[model samples]
Target chain A: GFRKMAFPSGKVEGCMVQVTCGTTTLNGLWLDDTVYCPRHVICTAEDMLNPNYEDLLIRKSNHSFLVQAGNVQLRVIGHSMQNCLLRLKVDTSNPKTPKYKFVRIQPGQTFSVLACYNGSPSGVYQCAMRPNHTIKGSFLNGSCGSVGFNIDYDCVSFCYMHHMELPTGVHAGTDLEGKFYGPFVDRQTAQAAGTDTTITLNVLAWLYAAVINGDRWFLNRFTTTLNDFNLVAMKYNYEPLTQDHVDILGPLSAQTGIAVLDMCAALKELLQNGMNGRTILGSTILEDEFTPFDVVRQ
Target chain B: GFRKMAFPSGKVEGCMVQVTCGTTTLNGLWLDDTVYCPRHVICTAEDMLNPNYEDLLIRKSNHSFLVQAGNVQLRVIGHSMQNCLLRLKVDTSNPKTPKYKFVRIQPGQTFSVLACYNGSPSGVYQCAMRPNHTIKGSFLNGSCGSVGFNIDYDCVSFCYMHHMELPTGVHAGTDLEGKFYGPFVDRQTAQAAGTDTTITLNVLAWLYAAVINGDRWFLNRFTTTLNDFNLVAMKYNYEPLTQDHVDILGPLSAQTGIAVLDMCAALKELLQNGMNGRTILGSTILEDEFTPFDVVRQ
Candidate 1:
């Protein structure tokens, strides 16, 4: 049924107006003559008299009803909202159309509405009723709207203060002090004492790598020290191992964790049988009395 | 005439007899039954007693008459008696022989005779008579006993000292003091200053010669200062002059003397147009201002 009611035409007053979009509601003035129906409605005018009735319904058609109630009038709004009663029969096929209705607010009029929703997809929306079209409208489609409304549910953001976890095996299988065992020494005092030994090992490793890699730069870089060591060994009349000796023994021993003994034996054998073999007969051994395995045994 | 004066041997108590040879006279003691002639004569005492001595002399055809004045006993005592008449040789065939009727001394007892005669082959000659050969009985050629005398002449010898005079030229023309002027500074100092100017010309000359001479051992012999000088010169882009430079210009000039205005002009021209007519401005000017000549001039 259509109802026509008229009153003083001016700003709507003393009424709570509620306007809702997809997920947000607002209360504000209704300024336009045409106001959208329930769908695509972002704001509402409640209990307004006339309220410039002709201006309130900017679009009117035979398919739609012009409801004039109290100080508010509904003519027709968007093209889809033209047939108010026959909206069911009208083509509602546009998936891109606004699914919610919006309320219009007039200029210079104030109204209040409670806004409650999960989130909104687009648009400017407010709540009130008045003669001027002071209503906030949002573009009905999600793609063509403001970016603030587009929230990605799957994407994650991090804060500057967050720290990533350290990788596994980095400090794993360490001692009580979180340091690995073997030839490596971690205590400051022990490390200081073992610096020369460590350097020797490092040099050995570098030599080992350089020979295996066949990098001339690396070989040349360490040539002086290697030559010095060789001279020292030669001066003391001890045989020294070469790349070939290391190559033959390195792979065999490195395969087994227990191959350190084999490495020592190989080194001993090379020292005895190599060029300076005669010198090694009565020379001091490089090994310590207490081996690394002693701690584990204890 | 040869006079034969005899005294009775018994009549002369403690009587002595003597004979003389070449400028000296001697007295002899008379022995019983023998005529001991101190300076022997060719005759025996019996012959001397014989009044036919002159007939005996004529009888011996090859034997020259020898006067044996035994202790017939004339004690020929005065200095004038040394020249007493002994024998006379009248040899007219040999013009070189002299006929003197005096017996200065018998040839056997004569010490020596010195004769100086002009126009004679023996201008200054000395003759010594052998003892026991004064009386000539038999003649044997080339025998010591048969020789009349042994002669020697005065000999002369000479010695000298030699030396070389100093060469002529301007002694002050070359830079003598500049020869040993170096050991200016250390290499570190030169490197720090970025200029080798502190290194004197002397050191540079040494290094230049060393390199050019291909004396590798010499290269290492320089003191730190001299080595620094070399390094400084090398750093400062100075080319060590070759042996050719030294050959063209003598060592002295090559070491200390720069070719003044000529070199300056050459350097200037080189800087102005050497590199394809482009200005190659060198580090410093080749002015005489920096010359070691200042030291000498002062």
Candidate 2:
């Protein structure tokens, strides 16, 4: 037998109803005109009723659901729901005047997503998402389904008004010919822009694993500097340096072209020696002009 | 006219006295059976008097000074002190039975410097000191004066009992012939060992600027692995990867040999790629075994 309904306002219209998954018998959320069952829960609204006659179950912008009187007979079967939400739509209808927009179907709420890529790539969202979050969009040449641009649960999505500026200015070799340049987007930028701390950590971890360790491009592009990095035309046949070498010879001074991030001295030597010729250009992020948004989809 | 003294104890023996520099008139401490005047203050102890009968000026192990009945005469002229202290001594008497000991003449205190080099170099003290701090010891073959062992003000010095164990275990290439291995001592070790946060920051900054960017040995020794780092004898000549490369191809997995420090994504790539072959071996540090000592020179 079904447990007595908590929201006892049976069959009331425009009321928030308490719904349970028949398989798990655990609570489920009715959001965005659809049901959000907990992970691995069967999608069946069992024993639905509005006991308190108040909008208790309606979280943030979700509208109230109509309470059905007769046992809310099961509509669909063999349907299970994942714990996360998925992206629902994007502005792809007008390809010529295509606007880069996204929609987030979060558990408690739904908001229009303004994917901010001030000095970063769209893939940043991939890093900014918690491992459980996901996105469905076109890659460098990949195509998105007609359902439009949307992200999965737990991914970072910037609202239209919640964008921040980055620190950007030109340095020597600002725009060298035949050389590709990218913004210096790192953990600090993501943090300053109010990205979730855990998300930032995930992004950082991926960057280290993927680009630094595996990418074949950077391995050859950056050359080792023999003497002073400022000095050009230095010979290259010297053997690789050991920590003992730096220990005996003393640490080298900070050079140009590398972003001298704050880290330990030994690690700093490792970093600067690793990248001698490339410029770690700054982004367009500012801390004071506007307060970065702090909204995480619950 | 001179101001009335704060302490009316007059001329009691072993009394804490308030001394001032004649030039700056700033307060100075009578520590370690000697006087430690403020930076740039004349060494001459001026207005020396026992401000309070209690041993207020005797910070830590310092004994109270003997309050003299008459005005203490100026000892030396044209002797201005620097804002920092210098290393005074190291165990060099018996070169055969040499000892790596140091002493710290800190503000209001003097303690025996055990000079812990546990998985780090003696130079770590250099990074552990605030920029305003200094140390005096022979580098490589430099000689030390007979003052025994001592570090200057602001330098890091550990007490005999304050040592913390580091994490040390063999890696894949733990003592490869002709391949030198060093401890992975970085900001984390310094932090876990109760080093000042500012000192930790300094250490990280220096490591990045010096060894990573400018070290000639690493520039030559560490080869760019085109394939997996685990694969031996991978072909070189692949171009260095960019953040954009990883974004397009997706991130690579974490490999061995490099220390995957906790940092932002892009920076992690820069660090890991920079050290493909060398081992960032763990030190002899354990976090939970003992509480790190928290003592900073004020």
Residue runs of model 2 more than 4 Å from their true location after superposition? A1-298, B1-18, B27-32, B38-40, B43-256, B259-298
Q: Each predicted complex: what DockQ? A: 0.00, 0.01
For residues B1-298, could you state the per-residue lDDT of candidate 1 as single tens digits? 0000011111111212333333323332122322122111324444433334334334443223221233232222221111111222221122212211112222112111111011010101112111221221111111111011111111110000000011110010001111101221111112111122221232233233322323222122112232333354454444333344334334433544333222323333333332231211111221111112211211
Off by over 4 Å in 1: A1-204, A214-262, A269-298, B1-298
TM-score of each: 0.11, 0.17
Q: Kindly give the stretch of ten consecutive residues in candidate 2 chain A with the minimal lDDT sum.
A: A1-10
Q: Which is the leading candidate under lDDT?
A: 1
> Candidate 1 lDDT, tens digit per residue, A1-298?
0000111111121111233233433221122332222221221233122233234334434334333222343333343323211121222222222222222221222222111111111111112111121112211212111111100121211100000111110110111111222232211112211111111222233223323323212112112233445445454443343444345445523533323333333333343443221211111222111112111111
